[PDB]
């Protein structure tokens, strides 16, 4: 009863270039969000993209195959919304 | 090991006015996001705000106290990111 997710946090321009990059690998995620942040907190590098996946296996394939620059923090988790 | 959440989906201008409204009730949520959407899907009314809470009790207080217009879909769930 959950959706496996990845969040990408960092600078909004890097994240934008990263999106160019992963639109080449569209079979490896189900959805990706516009770029957002928590209101009040992005005075930083605290911009975020969320991706959703069909399974944890598809998520592993994304992270195996899709190289994420080191200036971006990658967290994995789940959602049930 | 989870964060109770609310997502608000609907038109971005309504959501913006709603944010004016709930900044008056800031003790009743921990964080609220900028307005976002799933890329490709917002050709609609498919814009979104996420709020996070300290507990499910604080979430109930938010939804008890903070009236949400009917043009906005309110879903509740959890995240672990």
UniProtKB/Swiss-Prot annotation, chains A, B:
It comes from the Viruses. Residues 2-81 are annotated as: DNA-binding domain. Signal peptide: none annotated. There is a cross-link at residue 9 (Glycyl lysine isopeptide (Lys-Gly) (interchain with G-Cter in SUMO)). Phosphorylated. It is found in: Host nucleus. HPV16, in comparison to HPV types 6 and 11, is more often associated with malignant genital cancers in humans. Belongs to the papillomaviridae E2 protein family. Plays a role in the initiation of viral DNA replication. A dimer of E2 interacts with a dimer of E1 in order to improve specificity of E1 DNA binding activity. Once the complex recognizes and binds DNA at specific sites, the E2 dimer is removed from DNA. E2 also regulates viral transcription through binding to the E2RE response element (5'-ACCNNNNNNGGT-3') present in multiple copies in the regulatory regions of the viral genome. Activates or represses transcription depending on E2RE's position with regards to proximal promoter elements including the TATA-box. Binds DNA as homodimer. Interacts with protein E1; this interaction greatly increases E1 DNA-binding activity. Interacts with protein L1; this interaction enhances E2-dependent replication and transcription activation. Interacts with protein L2; this interaction inhibits E2 transcriptional activity but not DNA replication function E2. Interacts with protein E7; this interaction inhibits E7 oncogenic activity. Interacts with host TAF1; this interaction modulates E2-dependent transcriptional regulation. Interacts with host BRD4; this interaction mediates E2 transcriptional activation function. This is Regulatory protein E2. The gene is E2.
């Amino acid at each position: 009863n959950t959706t496996p997710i990845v969040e990408l946090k960092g600078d909004a321009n890097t994240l934008k270039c990263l999106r160019y990059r992963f639109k080449k690998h569209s079979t490896l995620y189900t959805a990706v969000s516009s770029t957002w942040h928590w209101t009040g907190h992005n005075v930083k590098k605290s911009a975020i993209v969320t991706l959703t996946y069909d399974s944890e296996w598809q998520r592993d394939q994304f992270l195996s195959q899709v190289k994420i620059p080191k200036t971006i923090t990658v967290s994995t988790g789940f959602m049930s919304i």
